[PDB]
Amino acid sequence: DAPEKNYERTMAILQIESEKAELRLKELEVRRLMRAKGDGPWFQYPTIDKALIDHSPKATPDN
Amino acid sequence: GWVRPDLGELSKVTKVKTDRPLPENPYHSRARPEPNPEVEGDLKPARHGSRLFFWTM
Numbered sequence: 006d007a008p009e010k011n012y013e014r015t016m017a018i019l020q021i022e023s024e025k026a027e028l029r030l031k032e033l034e035v036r037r038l039m040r041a042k043g044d045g046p047w048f049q050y051p052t053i054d055k056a057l058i059d060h061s062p063k064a065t066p067d068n
Numbered sequence: 069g070w071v072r073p074d075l076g077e078l079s080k081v082t083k084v085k086t087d088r089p090l091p092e093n094p095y096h097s098r099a100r101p102e103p104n105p106e107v108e109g110d111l112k113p114a115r116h117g118s119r120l121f122f123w124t125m
């Protein structure tokens with residue numbers, strides 16, 4: 006290989022691997038924040054569906 | 069002059085004209101929590117793949 010080719014190929018490798026490393030660090034920080042706060046699309050543990058509630062008039066009024 | 073109701077009449081659901089207002093919050097409920105943001109946007113591929121340690125795809 007030419008030194009130019011190896012040099013610029015090394016630069017492409019370094020850019021790809023540095024971008025992957027920054028995305029892994031951001032992924033760790035995102036997972037930490039979403040587990041702590043629960044406001045993201047991850048760590049959404051189920052609650053009861055409110056569509057199961059009967060909203061009809063019952064046999065007694067006070068409900 | 070009173071007529072006794074037939075079989076089935078006293079079990080009817082009738083309509084009532086009232087002057088009192090409809091209760092806007094009869095359960096005395098407070099404000100519901102704001103929902104989480106939904107997903108939106110076009111789904112692009114993962115940047116440089118899985119990024120699992122050395123896999124490039």
Ligand SMILES: CCCCCCCCCCCCCCCCCC(=O)OC[C@H](COP(=O)([O-])OC[C@H](O)COP(=O)([O-])OC[C@H](COC(=O)CCCCCCCCCCCCCCCCC)OC(=O)CCCCCCCCCCCCCCCCC)OC(=O)CCCCCCCCCCCCCCCCC
Nearest residue numbers: 014017018021022025116117118119120121122123124125
């Ligand atoms: C226009 C339409 C048509 C277009 C057609 C174009 C194609 C034309 C040619 C057709 C053939 C194409 C073949 C696929 C492309 C080349 C893939 C490749 O070599 O990846 C390099 C891959 C990464 O190298 P690279 O330089 O970064 O990328 C070059 C390319 O860009 C690689 O491209 P990439 O970056 O996209 O690669 C993606 C990713 C790149 O890889 C990664 O991201 C890294 C992780 C790789 C896995 C590491 C696993 C480590 C632990 C297990 C070790 C296994 C034990 C060793 C084997 C024991 C003996 C069987 O690969 C994977 O994730 C796949 C996993 C590895 C399988 C590779 C394909 C094998 C197909 C044939 C299998 C035959 C048996 C092979 C041996 C079994 C083990 C593989 O090399 C290695 O990891 C080293 C191992 C070599 C892989 C096998 C070589 C394939 C050809 C073997 C033929 C001879 C077989 C002899 C008989 C059977 C064995 C006894």
